[PDB]
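User: I'm putting together a teaching handout on how multi-component assemblies are represented. Below are the sequence lines for each component of a complex, exactly as they appear in our records. Could you produce the 3D structure of the whole assembly as structure tokens, so the students can see both representations side by side? Please keep the chain order the same as the input.
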Amino acid sequence: RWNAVLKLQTLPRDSSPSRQRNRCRQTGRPHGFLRKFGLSRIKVREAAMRGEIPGLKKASW
Amino acid sequence: KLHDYYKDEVVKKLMTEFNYNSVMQVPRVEKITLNMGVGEAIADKKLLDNAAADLAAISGQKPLITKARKSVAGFKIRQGYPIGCKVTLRGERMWEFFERLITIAVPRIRDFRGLSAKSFDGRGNYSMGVREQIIFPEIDYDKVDRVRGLDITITTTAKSDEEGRALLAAFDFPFRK
Amino acid sequence: ARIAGINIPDHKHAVIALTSIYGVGKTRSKAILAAAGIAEDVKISELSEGQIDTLRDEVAKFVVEGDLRREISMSIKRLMDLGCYRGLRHRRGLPVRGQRTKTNARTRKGPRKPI
Amino acid sequence: PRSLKKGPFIDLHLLKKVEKAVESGDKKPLRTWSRRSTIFPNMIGLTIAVHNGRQHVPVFVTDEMVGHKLGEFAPTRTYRGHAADKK
RNA sequence: CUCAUAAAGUGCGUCGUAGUCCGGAUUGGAGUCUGCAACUCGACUCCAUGAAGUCGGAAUCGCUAGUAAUCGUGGAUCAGAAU
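Assistant: Of course. Below is the structure of the complete assembly, with chains in the same order as your input.
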């Protein structure tokens, strides 16, 4: 929820600055993200196929 | 024994606090019909043997094999086929089989319930629902082949749902709500 | 021989002889025979009168027959009286569609059937 | 002509909390406004309240309910069913 | 380190056609999971049920020595449903 995404709040609660987690930027999924892009595993793929992600290419075999 | 008090003592009491009328009408004699479980279909030329052979142990005399009235109708029926087979009699007998039936052996089955659903609705003839395996004090525990399970009825001339069943729960239990 | 809800397991091994009861099966067969101490390779016609007795009392304590089926009916009636699609699914007498089914639908049903 | 392929629509809000209550079992009935979302596993056993436009109605999610939208179990209109309303 | 148990063989026992734990279909109940989902489309199996058969109408197909019939396993394609 817009409330759960409290990560956006620079100043954390009673917890130390370590409280700040991550949260995806496109979908906002805290589950599996990718620091480098800051996007979730389900967004990095959709963004990859579209080609909106520069330098990124689908590995072949 | 415990059966005479129900026609002189526990009959006026159940007609004073919630009735206000005369003495009769509530509840007599008259024979009580005891039907048998449909023997047709189950098997072929047999069962009739083991029949009347077990229905003559709990009571006296032997059932009679009577046919219907020779009059073909809109159904598969021939002329001269033993069907029904019913025999009911009394005089003073139908009074004890209301004692050794609902006192001992019960509760003493194996998985008896206790709560019964509203049998009848706007009549007098109640209902029942017993399984195939029963344990009675007047039956051998090991020598009877093919367990039999016959229902139990009771004819009454009531006029309302209430005012009745108050006499049934006067000796025949259990019966929770 | 007689055991629970009228069962006639004749000419069979003490094992499956019980695997014919809507209540007990294979697993219950080996356990019941091991608890009562009975050979699983003996026919029902070779079983003593004392072995069957100890087999009826132990198997007696179980859930089977009508009393169980009624519980199933009630379980299908409870969700049927409510506004659950599953309950209406059991009936299937409800509209399978998108037009109405109550009336004007003989083009798919055909001649009016008896109620 | 339904369609979901691999892109189900689960309002990011009613999906983040439903997962938060998964920390240790489930949580008491919740309330959501967007019924456009679709029911899924994580929401099994929980009691989500959909907004019919006036109030929130408790909808006990079930495995058999998975796949359908919350709005499908939240009737908009209200028909008294003018009758003995039996069954 | 794991997928792996190779299946069969080898040794032993059961059985010889009685719907008998032989044969396992079908069906009821419970239940895990891959998957954002599996009512229609799943795999598997706990629990119970447990039929058709004792080599099956008119016709028709593959095969000749480690071959036929039969059983199990791996891989290519592939995020993922490969009888």
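A couple of points students might notice: Chain D touches chain C through three residues (CB under 8 Å). Chain D is about 10% helix and 15% strand.
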